[PDB]
């Protein structure tokens, strides 16, 4: 057996073909086992509608999740990714840096 803690990155992107749209992204990488819970948070509250959840693996024991959705950030709102995994005794919350 092998278990690996996810790396968690939170960032925003504008699709070049539609530059006024903005997406909040949580890239959860290199984890095993594949069982996992991932949410985007807005002001501590789970975002229920997340448009894209793309899971892949490289080696049979390394998984990758891109979890993202359109959003409209205001300088007052706080966003984050929350991840639960067997390797994490407490849920891990990674805050979005607004300049990322």
Author numbering: 0 to 99
Sentences from the paper on this structure:
Beta-2 microglobulin (β2m) is a 99-residue protein, physiologically acting as the light chain of the major histocompatibility complex (MHC) class I. β2m displays a classic immunoglobulin fold, and is well conserved among vertebrates. β2m tertiary structure consists of a seven-stranded beta-sandwich; according to standard nomenclature, β-strands are named from A to G, and loops are named after the neighbouring β-strands. The mutant protein is the etiological agent of a previously unknown systemic amyloidosis, whereby patients carrying the D76N mutation accumulate large mutant β2m amyloid deposits, especially in internal organs.
Given that β2m thermodynamic stability and aggregation propensity strongly depend on DE-loop backbone geometry, expectedly the side chain substitution (D to N) does not affect β2m fold stability. The RMSD values suggest that the three variants match more closely the wt β2m structure than that of the highly amyloidogenic D76N mutant. The D53N, D59N and D98N variants, which match very closely the wt 3D structure, show a similar Bz-score pattern, with positive peaks corresponding to AB-, CC’D-, DE-, EF-loops, and the C-terminus.
